[PDB]
Design a binder for this molecule. Structure first.
Ligand SMILES: CCCCCCCCCCCCCCCCCC(=O)OC[C@H](COP(=O)([O-])OCC(O)COP(=O)([O-])OC[C@@H](COC(=O)CCCCCCCCCCCCCCCCC)OC(=O)CCCCCCCCCCCCCCCCC)OC(=O)CCCCCCCCCCCCCCCCC
Ligand SMILES: CCCCCCCCCCCCCC(=O)SCCNC(=O)CCNC(=O)[C@@H](O)C(C)(C)COP(=O)(O)O
Ligand code: SF4
Ligand code: SF4
Ligand code: SF4
Ligand code: SF4
Ligand code: FES
Ligand SMILES: [K+]
Ligand SMILES: [Zn+2]
Lengths: 176, 381, 114, 95, 208, 48, 96, 126, 263, 113
């Protein structure tokens, strides 16, 4: 159940001693290393042509946050505050009140994307699939406060990315 | 008089060297440059919320530290994962072991000067990060291994790709080993370097390869076994001289034996669920959260309060690729930990750095900091 | 009410340790201003060391002043050995902080803090 | 259904808009105030009241496990529709 | 209780109970309690004067042979007059076992350093100085290891706040990173998550 | 597409020269891909 | 997989290994990115009878630690376990 | 011997590293917390708690968040008895005030009192 | 004295004659679960959540209304007690609506908390649920009667402490509905305290509705100044803004009630 | 048999392990005789040392002595006998057979609090 690495004794006949001296004087394993590097010279490299080629992803990928709507335009979020209760970074801040038709909705839904650890506990705690961590990873900003999303930015992320978010949830919800 | 150098932070490490010309008389590693106060932030967060901190301790051994914390919490909860979750944990723990030993060997060669097998083996490491992203959605910090099992079942066609990876990965190990093992320049940088006796290795709190390079026959997957490591068949590599070269060979052979374990885990994956079927610990399915009243109450209370862990203290140690990774978890009966000490192997290894670099030279210090696979996230917490 | 000592048996051995620590700091302050190339005078650094010693002058417990001498030794070790940078030395001089309001009336003006 | 303050600044679906004398409009000077133009309170008012022939109706928001938790709505009031508390859809017994 | 309940190991439980009797009767001078948890882990609660005699016993006695120091830990419990609880996790490779050795101190009583027994402690209890303020006597190099150099206070004490008292920022007047009193743009939101119903009747404490 | 290439090269995009009022002849940008093509291009699905 | 047989033969000679059998670039042998939908199994507690939670409770069968010795004959000297069984050498590849 | 005698009051205020602004100005409230009247369970009324007076919370100019400058705003300490909390507050130089534990007084419950012959305590319905 | 000895899980306790099983268990620190029992209302005995085994007795008894006899050993943790609790919690959650995200009582719900502590972790209910018509009892109490579990703390409070006699149960069986039977506006001077004693989200606070959530609120203990009674209150706040006012238990002032102006 | 290496780094091969273990075990018993009889350490250490010494005196072979001493290689059995000897020499000075030096405080090991 165990094996000894590096517990070989070299032979001491004239054959193997001359083999080790030929390896010393003729640099044979160094030529072996040159041969391996020369072998990789004549391979196709693994390099994709970004931005024109993209690395392969899965439908479970956890990128930029978005707030989804029902297929009637009504937003799914009903202010239950499970997502800021489970948020390990406390990146989510929610404030709510009943709006003009009596619906339980949020007035504040903020996600500090610089606090966020992108672990997706908010999408798996959400009982109505409102907050999702969608596919977008190319949302780098030139300013720190541009990574402090309010509810309007997250609803625009949902309206921007719903055509892809709904297909990823369709491909993945049976594992959940 | 004698020379005193400060190899500063220009992970990261400050080193105060007392040299006597070319020799090294004293090596003082000033650390704390990545001390973030993890195990104080754990105290104000629930057990599920404290789980993603363990991804970021040994940030090349993510699912291993997830597994150690999950085993600590499941030990205090007196529950056990389903068998399929156990085989998935051992499978991704050995994939994590391949990740960590590629990082270890290729950066240990990069710092010495062999910069090429770095690029050769990070494509394989890129494919294993695609396996992590397919199983969890993130490439490094998955938050996948949870107390109760894992978060989500394997997507269909993942095991065929783990097969296609594992079929070809031994040739990658062979061409790494072609570049470095019989190479006389690599041997001249690692043979007489940092010889650690077995008694001082037991005394200094060393663990893993740092013991097994010195001939100590100790592996926690054999002696104190966890999830299904008593059901897989593998060998434990043992060194002979306690140097950097034996520890290199032990890590290459642990890549070999991890490929062996991954083949056995692909051939022996059982059917079944992946969480514990106690819905007071692991959350219910989303189809039954949205239909059952008990399951909605349990979803609400697990994702807001969390499960209450019974009061007690445990030290749960697993065999992470850097060695014995331990969690001393103290629970006061609430849904948040009272205390979580994180034992990591690199802390005791970097404590023994000063003995290992006595009588050596300045360019041997980088070889000794390489043979102890030191990730400063796990050292400084 | 019988406790185990740290180094001192009563207050006089502790004042001996405080006195030798103050001597070591008083000798160190010119080297500290020199090699950190600080913008303070040597007299001003010595006044800061006098202020930091007189801040804790009310302590009548031997174990507490034992731990204060030990922590002053650790600060002096981090000062002699160049482990601190210029920023760590100058954190004793709260320069960029605003002057805090002292009387009742300005504290009434600026906020709610007593 | 957005509207606009007399400052020219757009009004959100909450009803938030900065005052005329508020300095915090200087963050929108040279830039834009990002509001969403699809107000959910206006989009849910466009949906027809579903006429059903039962006394108690159920709603899951559509999709089954893709919707909300399934709730039951009593339809005993002929004066008023029975609105789903999650998705905002509303129902009426047809008799 | 077959699928979902962790199985009890009564063999290791009886063995650790016998070895706890063994350690309690060989060393009655310091051993104050001996307890075995329901998941079969042994704790030896000793007096702080016997840190060196207990740890050298378990390291050297041929039935113990606890050669490895896995972990060294302090726990802050402010409701005790000896608030700090020093935990030694020991590994025997000969008998494949683990033992916990627990002692106690307050802020001012020093604990004797176990670097004579296990040199691994040379950083660990050094960490306990940086994090908890527990002084260790006869330590070779006792100083801070994890916090910043001018840091006042000990962070893992539970009367110490989650954030510090000072925060750093670069100031351009003095051309220097400076420390200022901490002011958060958003307060850390304390959640009161404890359920008011009793979860575990086995751990019920008797009332007054 | 080109299913003879290896996995990663087998799907690609040639960005337009003008999108939303910006001359993207040289300033090609990763965020120019609309989300219906973002599953196909990032291989989240097999289906265009 | 697109290399001509001259470059392929030079590459296999320079490496010394058969590289087309084990290529580190992935091709059509991988899984499809679009999969048929799963049907995940229920666990053992998904039953309608004999399924009381008081017979499968884990957190409430855990006990406080049993106090062996507290301060409020010719018995055998004991160890915390029997001594560790000596590891057998591997039969697969012991390097011996 | 190796044991000294310190008859002084225990005081660690110069060791804890707290700035003086948050020592001699803060008032620690030591109390058993009241039962949440939304609920009927009493597991939160078992332990003594030490909290502090609230300081100023204000609105963030950027996001509208609750900015604070109080480092001790989230500090809640748990104690088994009142005397441990008093000793811990005296040890740390914190001025304190102690609210006594309020316990519910024993109630005389009779189900038959709902159905009396001549008393006012009959229920009108059930 | 005249104290009779009873036993709770083998532990002896000395109780007054007339003391129930639930108070005898309270005297050793064990809290029997309950929904309809409240220590200031009359005893109803009609939710059956307090069913507990007395040993050498082949029937669980309602602990809130059963006086102890001298010599009983109350098994608060035995097998048939826990089976009684799981069965009663299954029937309570049979028709209860899946409204926990849209309910104000979530995070502070008795039905949630002791469904976690004492209920089963899943459902055997494969049927449709009842849905109850909502009532209108004023601008203070939001009434969502689908969430009602029919514990009749409404009726006992309005009948005994508020002295109103305008809440009651109309109907019979599963169709039994707590309400007023007419559009009557329940406006007492103590009309908000039924928000306190309702163990579920059937009666919530209408001004407090949807705004906050009880885990994120900081609880500050304070004094009422609306009247000269001196009622002990908890002001619960959230991010520097006052969210609501709750009573505190003071046995000599406001026992656990407050007036509607205070609330 | 002349075992070429022990396997453990820093531990050289002892040529005559039997006489070395006999000398170390009799020296352990000679140092251990200075402990009072009512101490449990003396009785337990005499018991295990007499078992080990009877096993050493029973077997002429080194390797079967390794398989029946049940302590690994014979050289780390020698090293553990040296550690036991130094331990007994410390235990004479410590005198830990005495009663408890101090009762703990009342809630010192009560968990949870
Ligand atoms: C040595 C000197 C160069 C001699 C020609 C040569 O070796 O061509 C590479 C050619 C291709 O090698 P390969 O590795 O088998 O490539 C397979 C690819 O699938 C074949 O590549 P592909 O299938 O992807 O086809 C596309 C490719 C087709 O490839 C070519 O056109 C090859 C380049 C020709 C110039 O065309 C391009 O990429 C356009 C490249 C244009 C610039 C090429 C460099 C110019 C250098 C002088 C300035 O090499 C050989 O055929 C073997 C060696 C021939 C030696 C000739 C005598 C000397
Ligand atoms: C450049 C700036 C660097 C700043 C240096 C910071 C180091 C400061 C370390 C602080 C060390 C102490 O505070 S220990 C002193 C505490 N001593 C006491 O509480 C006992 C009372 N001590 C005294 O009154 C002292 O003045 C004397 C000199 C010991 C006795 O004077 P009395 O007699 O009349
Ligand atoms: S992904 Fe995680 S850290 Fe980010 S908002 Fe969601 S729960 Fe919070
Ligand atoms: S996003 Fe989801 S979890 Fe968060 S408050 Fe809204 S409905 Fe609840
Ligand atoms: S009353 Fe309780 S169980 Fe019912 S919906 Fe509200 S929180 Fe959930
Ligand atoms: S509304 Fe509430 S208090 Fe009234 S009977 Fe129903 S559950 Fe009880
Ligand atoms: S509590 Fe006794 S039956 Fe309701
Ligand atoms: K209520
Ligand atoms: Zn709906």
């Amino acid at each position: 159940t165990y094996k000894y690495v590096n517990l070989r004794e070299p032979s001491m006949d004239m054959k193997s001693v001359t083999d080790r001296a030929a390896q010393t004087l003729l640099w044979t394993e160094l030529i072996r290393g040159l041969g391996m590097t020369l072998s990789y010279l004549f391979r196709e490299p693994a390099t994709i042509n970004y931005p024109f080629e993209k690395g392969p992803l899965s439908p479970r990928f956890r990128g930029e946050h978005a707030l989804r709507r029902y297929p009637s335009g009504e937003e799914r979020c009903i202010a239950c505050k499970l997502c800021e209760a489970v948020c390990p970074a406390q990146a989510i801040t929610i404030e709510a009140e009943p709006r003009a038709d009596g619906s339980r909705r949020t007035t504040r839904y903020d996600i500090d994307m610089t606090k966020c650890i992108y672990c997706g506990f908010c999408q798996e705690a959400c009982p109505v699939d409102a907050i999702v961590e969608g596919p977008n990873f190319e949302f780098s900003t030139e300013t720190h406060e541009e990574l402090l999303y309010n509810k309007e930015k997250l609803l625009n992320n949902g309206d921007k990315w719903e055509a892809e978010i709904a297909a990823n949830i369709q491909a993945d919800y049976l594992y959940r | 008089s004698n020379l005193t150098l400060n190899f500063g932070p220009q992970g990261v490490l400050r080193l105060v060297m007392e040299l006597s010309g070319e020799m090294v008389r004293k090596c003082d590693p000033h650390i704390g440059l990545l001390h973030r106060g993890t195990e104080k932030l754990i105290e104000y967060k629930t057990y599920l919320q404290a789980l993603p901190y363990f991804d970021r301790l040994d940030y090349v051994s993510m699912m291993c530290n997830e597994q150690a914390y999950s085993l600590a919490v499941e030990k205090l909860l007196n529950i056990q994962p389903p068998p399929r979750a156990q085989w998935i944990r051992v499978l991704f723990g050995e994939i994590t072991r391949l990740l960590n030993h590629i990082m270890a060997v290729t950066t240990h060669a990069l710092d010495i000067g062999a910069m090429t097998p770095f690029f050769w083996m990070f494509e394989e490491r890129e494919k294993m990060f695609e396996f992590y992203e397919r199983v969890s959605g993130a490439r490094m910090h998955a938050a996948y291994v949870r107390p109760g099992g894992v978060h989500q079942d394997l997507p269909l066609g993942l095991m065929d790709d783990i097969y296609e990876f594992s079929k070809n990965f031994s040739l990658r190990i062979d061409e790494l080993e072609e570049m470095l093992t019989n190479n006389r320049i690599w041997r001249n940088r690692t043979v007489d370097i940092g010889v650690v006796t077995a008694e001082d290795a037991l005394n200094y709190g060393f663990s893993g390869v740092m013991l097994r390079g010195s001939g100590i026959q100790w592996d926690l997957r054999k002696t104190q076994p966890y999830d299904v490591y008593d059901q897989v068949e593998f060998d434990v590599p043992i060194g002979s001289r306690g140097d950097c070269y034996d520890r290199y060979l032990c890590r290459v052979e642990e890549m070999r034996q991890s490929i062996r374990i991954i083949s056995q885990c692909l051939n022996k994956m059982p059917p079944g669920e992946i969480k514990v079927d106690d819905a007071k610990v692991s959350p219910p399915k989303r189809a039954e959260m949205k239909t059952s009243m008990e399951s909605l109450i349990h979803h609400f209370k697990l994702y807001t309060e969390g499960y209450q862990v019974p009061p007690g203290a445990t030290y749960t140690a697993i065999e992470a690729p850097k060695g014995e990774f331990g969690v001393y978890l103290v629970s006061d009966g609430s849904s948040r930990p009272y205390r979580c000490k994180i034992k990591a192997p690199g802390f005791a290894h970097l404590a023994g750095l000063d003995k290992m670099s006595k009588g050596h030279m300045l360019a041997d210090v980088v070889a000794i900091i390489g043979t102890q696979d030191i990730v400063f996230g796990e050292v400084d917490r | 009410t019988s406790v185990k000592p740290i180094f001192s048996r009563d207050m006089n051995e502790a004042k001996r340790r405080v006195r030798e620590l103050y001597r070591a700091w008083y000798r160190e302050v010119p080297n500290t201003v020199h090699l950190f190339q600080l913008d303070i005078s040597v007299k001003q650094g010595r006044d800061k060391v006098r202020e930091m010693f007189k801040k804790n002058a009310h302590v009548t417990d031997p174990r507490v002043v034992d731990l204060l001498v030990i922590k002053g030794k650790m600060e002096l070790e981090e000062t002699i050995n160049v482990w601190k940078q210029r920023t760590h030395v100058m954190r004793f001089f709260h320069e960029t902080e605003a002057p805090r309001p002292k009387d009742f009336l300005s504290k009434f003006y600026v906020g709610h803090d007593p | 259904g957005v509207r606009t303050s007399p400052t020219g600044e757009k009004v959100t679906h909450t009803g938030q808009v900065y005052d005329d004398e508020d300095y915090r409009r200087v963050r929108f000077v040279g830039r834009q105030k990002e509001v969403n133009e699809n107000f959910a309170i206006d989009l849910i008012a466009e949906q027809p009241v579903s006429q059903v022939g039962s006394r108690v109706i159920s709603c899951d928001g559509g999709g089954g496990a893709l919707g909300h938790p399934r709730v039951y709505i009593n339809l005993d009031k002929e004066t008023k529709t029975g609105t789903c508390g999650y998705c905002g859809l509303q129902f009426r017994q047809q008799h | 209780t077959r699928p979902t309940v962790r199985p009890r190991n009564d063999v290791a439980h009886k063995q650790l109970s016998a070895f706890g009797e063994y350690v309690a009767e060989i060393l009655p001078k310091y051993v104050q309690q001996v307890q075995v948890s329901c998941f079969s882990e042994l704790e030896i609660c000793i007096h702080p004067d016997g840190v060196i005699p207990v740890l050298t016993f378990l390291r050297d006695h041929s039935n113990a042979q606890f050669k490895s120091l896995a972990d060294l830990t302090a726990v802050d419990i402010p409701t005790r007059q000896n608030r700090f609880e020093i935990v030694y996790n020991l590994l025997s490779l000969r008998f494949n076992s683990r033992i916990r050795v627990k002692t106690y101190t307050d802020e001012l009583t020093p604990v004797e350093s176990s670097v004579s027994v296990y040199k691994a402690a040379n950083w660990y209890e050094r960490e306990i100085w940086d994090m908890f303020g527990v002084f260790f006597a006869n330590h070779p190099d006792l100083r801070r290891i994890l916090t910043d150099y001018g840091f006042e206070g000990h962070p893992f004490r539970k009367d110490f706040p989650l954030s510090g008292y000072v925060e750093l920022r670069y100031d351009d007047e003095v051309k220097r990173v400076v420390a200022e009193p901490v002011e958060l743009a958003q307060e850390f939101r304390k959640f009161d998550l404890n359920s008011p119903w009793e979860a575990f009747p086995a751990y019920r404490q008797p009332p007054e | 597409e080109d299913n003879k290439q290896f996995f990663g090269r087998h799907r690609w995009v040639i960005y337009t020269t003008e999108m939303n009022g910006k001359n993207t002849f040289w300033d090609v940008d990763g965020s120019m891909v609309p989300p219906e093509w973002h599953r196909w291009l990032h291989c989240m699905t097999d289906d265009p | 997989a697109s290399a001509t047989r001259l470059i392929q033969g030079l590459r296999n000679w320079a490496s010394g290994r058969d590289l087309q059998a084990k290529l580190q670039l992935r091709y059509q042998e991988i899984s499809k990115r679009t999969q048929p939908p799963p049907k995940l199994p229920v666990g053992p507690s998904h039953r309608l009878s004999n399924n009381y939670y008081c017979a499968r409770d884990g957190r409430r069968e855990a006990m406080p630690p049993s106090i062996v010795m507290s301060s409020q004959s010719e018995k055998k000297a004991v160890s915390p376990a029997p001594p560790i069984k000596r590891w057998e050498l591997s039969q697969d590849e012991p390097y011996l | 011997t190796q044991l000294i005698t310190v008859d002084e009051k225990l005081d660690i205020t110069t060791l804890t590293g707290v700035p003086e602004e948050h020592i001699k100005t803060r008032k620690a409230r030591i109390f058993v917390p009241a039962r949440n009247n939304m609920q009927s369970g009493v597991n939160n009324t078992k332990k003594w708690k030490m909290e502090f007076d609230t300081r100023e919370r204000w609105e963030n100019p950027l996001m509208g968040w609750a900015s604070t400058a109080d480092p001790l705003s989230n500090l809640v300490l748990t104690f088994s008895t009142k005397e441990d909390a008093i000793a811990f507050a005296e040890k740390n130089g914190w001025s304190y005030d102690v609210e006594e534990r309020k316990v519910p007084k024993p109630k005389s419950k009779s189900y038959g009192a709902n159905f009396s012959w001549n008393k006012r305590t009959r229920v009108s319905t059930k | 004295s005249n104290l009779i000895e009873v036993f709770v899980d083998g532990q002896s306790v000395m109780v007054e004659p007339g003391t129930t099983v639930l108070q005898a268990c309270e005297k050793v620190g064990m809290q029997i679960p309950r929904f309809c029992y409240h220590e200031r209302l009359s005893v109803a005995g009609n939710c059956r959540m307090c069913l507990v085994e007395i040993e050498k007795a082949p029937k669980v008894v309602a602990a809130c209304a059963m006086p102890v006899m001298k010599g009983w050993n109350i098994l608060t943790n035995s097998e048939k007690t826990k089976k009684a609790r799981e069965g009663v919690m299954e029937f309570l959650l049979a028709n209860h609506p899946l409204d926990c995200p849209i309910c104000d009582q979530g995070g502070e719900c008795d039905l949630q908390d002791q469904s976690m502590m004492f209920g089963s972790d899943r459902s055997r209910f494969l049927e449709g649920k009842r849905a109850v018509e909502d009532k209108n009892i004023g601008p203070l109490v939001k009434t969502i009667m689908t969430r009602c579990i029919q514990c009749t703390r409404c009726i006992r409070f309005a009948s005994e402490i508020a002295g109103v006699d305008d809440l009651g149960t109309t109907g019979r069986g599963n169709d039994m509905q707590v309400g007023t039977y007419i559009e009557k506006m329940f406006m007492s001077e103590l009309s908000g305290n039924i928000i306190d004693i309702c163990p579920v989200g059937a009666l919530t606070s209408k001004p407090y509705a949807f705004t906050a959530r009880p885990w994120e609120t900081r609880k500050t203990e304070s004094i009422d100044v609306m009247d000269a009674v001196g009622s002990n209150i908890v002001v619960s706040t959230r991010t520097g803004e006052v969210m609501r006012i709750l009573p505190r238990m003071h046995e000599d002032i406001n026992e656990e009630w407050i007036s509607d102006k205070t609330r | 048999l002349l075992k070429k290496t022990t396997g453990l780094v820093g531990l050289a091969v002892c040529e005559t392990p039997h006489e070395r273990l006999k000398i170390l075990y009799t020296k352990i018993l000679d140092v251990l005789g200075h402990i009072p009889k009512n101490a449990a350490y003396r009785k337990y250490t005499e018991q295990i040392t007499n078992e080990k010494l009877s096993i050493v005196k029973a077997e002429p072979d080194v390797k079967k002595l390794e398989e029946q001493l049940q302590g690994g290689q014979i050289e780390e059995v020698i090293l553990q006998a040296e550690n036991e000897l130094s331990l007994a020499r410390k235990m004479i000075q410590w005198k830990p057979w005495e009663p408890l030096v101090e009762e703990p405080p009342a809630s010192q090991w009560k968990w949870p609090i």
